[PDB]
Amino acid sequence: VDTHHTITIAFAISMDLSDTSFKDLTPGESLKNSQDYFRIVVDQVSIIHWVDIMETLREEFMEIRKDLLNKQTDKGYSVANGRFSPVIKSNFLELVNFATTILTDPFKQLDLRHTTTHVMIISPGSGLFDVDYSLLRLTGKKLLSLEMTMDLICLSKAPLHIVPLFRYRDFENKLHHCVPLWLSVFFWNEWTPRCKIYDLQMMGITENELIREVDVEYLQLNKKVKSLSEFMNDYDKNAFEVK
Amino acid sequence: GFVPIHTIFYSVFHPTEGSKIKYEFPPNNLKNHGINFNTFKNYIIPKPILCHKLITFKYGTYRIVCYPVTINSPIYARNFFSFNFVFVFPYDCETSPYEPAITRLGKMFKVLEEQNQLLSKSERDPVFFDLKVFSIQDLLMRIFQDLNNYSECLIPIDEGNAVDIKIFPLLRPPTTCVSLEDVPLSSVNLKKIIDVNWDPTMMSIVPYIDGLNSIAKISKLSNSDPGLVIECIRHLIYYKCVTLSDIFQFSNIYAPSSLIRNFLTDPLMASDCQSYVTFPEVSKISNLPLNKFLPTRSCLFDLYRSLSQGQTLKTWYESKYMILKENNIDIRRFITFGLEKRIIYRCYSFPVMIMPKLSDEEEGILEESIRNAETFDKICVLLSKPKLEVESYLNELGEFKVINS
Amino acid sequence: GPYNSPTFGKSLSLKVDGGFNAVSINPSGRDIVLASRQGLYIIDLDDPFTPPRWLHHITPWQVADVQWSPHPAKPYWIVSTSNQKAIIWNLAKSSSNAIEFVLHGHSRAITDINFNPQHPDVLATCSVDTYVHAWDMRSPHRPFYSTSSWRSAASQVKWNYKDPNVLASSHGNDIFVWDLRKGSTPLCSLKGHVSSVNSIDFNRFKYSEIMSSSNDGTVKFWDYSKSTTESKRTVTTNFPIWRGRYLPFGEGYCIMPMVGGNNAVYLINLCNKKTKLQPIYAFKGHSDRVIDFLWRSRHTCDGDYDDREFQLVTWSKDCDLKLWPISDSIYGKVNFDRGKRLEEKLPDYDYCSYNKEPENFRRLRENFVTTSGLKKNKTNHITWLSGIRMNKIQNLGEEVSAIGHKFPKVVFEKISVSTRELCLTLNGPWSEENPDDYIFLRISINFPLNYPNKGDPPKFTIEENSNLTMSKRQEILSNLATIGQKYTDSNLYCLEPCIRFVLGEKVSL
Amino acid sequence: ECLPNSCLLGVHLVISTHSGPQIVYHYPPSNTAFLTNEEDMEVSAMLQDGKISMNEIFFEEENFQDINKILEFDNDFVAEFCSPEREMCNTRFEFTVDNFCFLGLPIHVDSQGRWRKSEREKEDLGKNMNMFHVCFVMNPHLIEYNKRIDDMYQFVVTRLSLLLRYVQSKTSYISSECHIILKEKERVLKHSKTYQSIRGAGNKGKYLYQRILAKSSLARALTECVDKIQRNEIACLEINDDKVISLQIPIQNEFEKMPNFKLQPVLRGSYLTSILNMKFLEKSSNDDLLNYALLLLDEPNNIISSLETFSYQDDIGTIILKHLVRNIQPNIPLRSYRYLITDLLDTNSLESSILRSCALHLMYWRHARIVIPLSSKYTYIVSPLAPIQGYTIDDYRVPLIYQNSMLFRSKFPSLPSLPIFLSLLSTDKPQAYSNIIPSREHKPVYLNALAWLIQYGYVTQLLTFINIRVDKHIKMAVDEDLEKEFEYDDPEMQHDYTIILEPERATAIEKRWLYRCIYGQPSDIQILFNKLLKYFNGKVPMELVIIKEEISRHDLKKLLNALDKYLIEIHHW
């Protein structure tokens, strides 16, 4: 199209300091102990140097595990400790409200050759996020007052639920699902599996510990049945009722 | 299983000496095995109608897979640069899992060649260029050896590019004939497989899977639409974890199958059958009268073969009730073990045509179910009523007969 | 003990079909484990004619490496790779439930596994995801040491024989030397190669000597205490080297190629100097490429002298597991001598056979179904016996394979070459009432110690049948005894004419 | 997937003259979107007569593409890359581009002008052509590539291409057919002003293909092959006006293990019987086929009409086969049908071999499934795979039960309808079929009805498998006999039951058990047990035992009733 855009690519990483496994995380609850890093790969640079931009980007992705997973120790060495947070528990609202900082002041220094301030978030999830309630309220109230369009593009397949989906907890600890009206979700690309079961895709659980432990429940008496004919008639009579 | 690669070679279009094998691992493998790069050279470096496509053909006993790439720019001589990373397999295998890896490798190297000319400048020959305006061999060796040994590779080729390949098996898509009257089992423990990335519906379906809950019951219990439950069950079938089964009643027509001899020829089937079908204690259900210490394997085999095509479970249980009381046998577990091992099956009941005032929607879905010859199970599920009420409603609607198939 | 083994010092070639990409040896010297995508095969070396024990684990991806546990108190532990996880098997359990616990580290395929030679309960696994992890078998939940190169997939991890907390890793063309006390910052990164590093090894007696092979035919020897860069020695061959390991005896090293060469292992004496490869002995054979080589040891129990004899076990792509004896000339050309005094007594291992299947409200005792008829006729036994080549007809196993192949209608009930017991069934025209009809028999055969060497024939015992009379039984036994007595005078093998005669096809004299 | 689906899209006839490769005829001119997801005297005469069979959805306006384009490829490029070199000819040409398998067996001339080793433009093209190729375009799914491509090459492409090579070698046919196709294309595009007046590209292509098929003979063969392999039918192709080739892809509609139709779909009405036709074809590469009876899958006149297309002229095969079809019944063994061979031609006799070949031919080409010789004394149940639900055989608007009931009333209007008939056989316990027949005046017609049911897969046969059991008394008795050569209580509810799985494959003590089981019965029971002990393994049906060993059914009843407490009955199909 022969455009003259001005790109600014920036990573945004959340590290989970706690040692608890990801399977033991309640849905709708944000990570308690977490650290937020930001790494700006390229500043305001026009797309005509795009090859160089992409070169930089590739290097900055291949040297992002060493910069974070290794930590400096005062004893005299490094420690390979630390784990990236998953997308569901990631700091998506913190990314959004970190992006809404270059446009906060209306009387900023003027870009005399560019006009719009479009923002794209590239996520490896499927539009499912766990957020805090107050942060969501503040994020919505801020985004309803500044000139930004946020196009979240997901690199995974479109899920069965509606996107974008935010799961949160109220003050009485009840799960609530909301779809924000300030985010536009795009997906980057018989039968296609739209649900993610990671442990069964990569065979991460072996044969002997994958066996079933809870079988069919034993039959029970109702304390009002006298004969086996009565029990059979009662089971056929209540075979289709839902409690 | 995954087929090992036989020969991997990198082919390039030289503007003077033509298409040729620039590099090849193992060395002198094609000439030793009889493969000649003068018969299929027009498919490896094709005219730009077959380019950017996954050309897979057969040469003798070797299946050859390739993704030829042609780049059009005035920088290269003759306005084109053509290459191909060609993999050779034995014919008698399945080259399905390696095809996306070859396609993605070709696409990645095309992107790199368009970006910074990583493959054109590696030849160290200015004849490839207009002239008016990293080792490939080691990479091929690493790809060949790592894909033969580990089925994975993380081979670095530059400061920011790496050949990153994992080979996944191909799985059959699941059935589409899953309905509301089919109960799901679970051959795997679904509690320990749940992680943070699951679908929200598939989290809720998991607690209500115990071999006795119907899909409509799961949908109403977990507050879910039946369609998404159907899709989630299909996804679980896709990974070979969940297998469907029938709703257990006391009016069913269970019958022996052709695999009842597996209860004798399998050394580990009857021993688990003794422990499975027994109540943990002396249950009270084994003490109710008909009207008012583990079981022997011969007893269980005699009880399996006592079923017949027309003897409902009520009649069989009231015809054999001293045996199921002295031996302390749970009849539902007794039936479910036979259905799980495919030694007995269910003869479905079909109401083919020849009370409280139900509403208009119920009578509409009743007529729609009767017109489609649906079973008693689906009508009972949809109307949320047992078999007797459905039979009375149908007899009020018209004369009909029951087929036990 | 080890000294009554009939397969030590004699060249024997197995045939294990199934595509096995990993082999390991019991330090006791009796069992060999082979890893495939379907699980593990365990093979007794002393009695190769027994079918291998199969432990089931189906994975789509190819297994990388398998390692026996060198802890002498736990000789039933085998560590095998299953893509991203490691399985510690237990041979004392059942064949279908042999998995004890699984190391669930890493995120991608495990590449190599090594045991610490000083602390035999400490493990190191290097994986494709750049991670080298150290595990403890006492608490196998998490790794107690994690390190990475952050650039390239690992290829091997090895421990230092002298320093218990020094381990080397190979990543691409660069080898790092990690120390457990420091962690994540190497002691030294040896950078002198051009192509990728395939194997890494440590000198058994030297403290800081490291050998690496490479794809460009460069075997480089470092003494990293002097200088990290360069190399103490460089040897150039005409082929890429896949596995290069130090000799356990004397001063020398054995290398083998992935492609090229003659698909043979070359043994080179060791008694900045770029030179060419000058092997002493090459293990010629193995028409396809060699997957791995292992060393089988044999020494006295309580002796204080170094009188151990060494054998080589090569597993190759042609589905052949060959045993190479080592002659005394190799013991002389390499600087190996029987030490008069040993500083430390060699470890002693239990010489058990982990091949036979272990024996494993209240149920009532009954016989639900007869074992006969439920049996599977052993047609895999004949195929296994066809693939064993000790040193026309050579031994009892080849004879059993030949009689199995020549007569597909003779069902074998029990085959035991080691105990010389052969129970086989056939249908024969041996009815006094109707000669045309066939009678089912269950003939059992006992062979002596020296079966074809002397005039002693087999002792045939036929189970009683109501269809078989005493006169017919006496006639059959007398004729079989006559055939065995006459046919062992020429020291030939009398099991083809005996079974042919009992089948009634012809008569031999 | 047991559901039949020959994933075919089209055929090309690519010849290689010395002037370059070219495409002579490709039948479906539709685009990728539809496929993946004296002027008219002879033409109208052949169309009304039925010699021009050609589909019409391929020539609709929304489903038409130009003749010069095949699946976004030009004819010149397709003719180029479907024409291999000499080293890649005379063998398989499995070529895949992107979800498109170009499959065929190219036939190339040797070093000499020989095609095989033991108007003047027509002879010029015959002497100038060096290769011809019949290329089928397939789109199988990625999980079923190695099955669909292999069966298509094994059953359709190989035989067709070999017959084409033979007919080209003897009397040049592909040369002549290609020449007349090209001449008719030239006469239609540049002449025959009726073509110009036709409005619409699709109708123009339909007229061109109609004229080509009216003039050519190979074009009709390729069109019929594409149209009938797609329909999963037997394609009979006329070649050289003297030979016929019958091509089919086999349909798996026979099952024994009751496949899980909830997960892996099965053709509705599949014959779920332990007696399978395929076990005789595989043994054609014990049990004799003459013992069984053939059940026709259609009316005999329709079978004769279909058998009139298997031979251009009436040879001896279609005389014997036609006379056998006209005089067959599914209630008599085939051994009794030797006389039909005996009168029509002048143990191990050639009549039995001819009858075996005819039965194999009938049961291979979807005409007559072989079954047990149906009688009124057998037990018949409703198969679980009964064609009840579904609007067609492979649906997965009236269900199959009511359609087949309409056919049943039309064919049998003097007896109760199909729902009543099936409910009388399924609701009660499975007993003999004769308990439904009210009178001997209705015995034959109901037998026909029974055959109809087994023709449609509604009703299968419940066979009996006898297993042998030994209690503790026989064990103590043989222990006492072995002595001739707790203890305080006697619980009568416990028996140490042992099932002899293989009576023939038994040891000495187990044979002692089985022989002590009969110690006390008369001579007839002893002879019947000693002749039928080896068949009590739970896998041999007793009906086949009765047929093979020539024993009475009442004798089997006596043997089963006498040994009541040691014989296990297993009743399944």
Structure characterization notes:
It is classed as signaling protein. The entry lists the keywords GTPase activating protein, GTPase, nutrient-sensing, amino acid signaling, cell growth, signaling protein. The entry is titled "Cryo-EM structure of the SEAC wing - EGOC". Chain A: Vacuolar membrane-associated protein IML1. Organism of A: Saccharomyces cerevisiae. Chain B: Nitrogen permease regulator 2. The structure is cut from a larger assembly and holds chains A (243 residues), B (405 residues), C (509 residues) and D (573 residues). Chain A has 243 residues and is of the alpha/beta class. Helices cover 21% and strands 22% of the residues of chain A. Chain A has 6 helices and 13 strands. Chain A has a 3-stranded antiparallel β-sheet, with no helix packed on it. A 3-stranded parallel β-sheet of chain A has the order 8-10-13, covered by helices on one side. In chain A, a hairpin with a 5-residue loop joins strand 5 and strand 6. In chain A, helix 3 packs parallel to helix 4 (133-143). Chain B contains 16 helices and 14 strands. The longest helix of chain B is centred in the first third of the chain and has 18 residues, at 99-116. Chain C is mainly beta and 509 residues long. Chain C has 6 helices and 35 strands. In chain C, the strands form 9 sheets. A 5-stranded mixed β-sheet of chain C has the order 18-19-20-21-25, with no helix packed on it. In chain C, strands 31, 32, 33, 34 and 35 form a 5-stranded antiparallel β-sheet that branches. In chain C, strand 18 and strand 19 (209-214) form a beta hairpin. Chain D is an alpha+beta fold. Chain D contains 22 helices and 19 strands. In chain D, the strands form 7 sheets. In chain D, strands 1, 2, 5, 6, 7 and 8 form a 6-stranded antiparallel β-sheet that branches. The longest helix of chain D has 26 residues, at 145-170. Chain D is elongated and about 105 Å long.
Short recap of the structure:
This is part of a larger assembly, with chains A (243 residues), B (405 residues), C (509 residues) and D (573 residues). Helices cover 34% and strands 17% of the residues of chain B.
Protein traits:
part of a larger assembly, 4 chains, B: 405 residues, alpha+beta, 6-stranded antiparallel sheet, 14 strands, C: 509 residues, mainly beta, 5-stranded mixed sheet, 5-stranded antiparallel sheet, 6 helices, 35 strands, signaling protein, GTPase, amino acid signaling
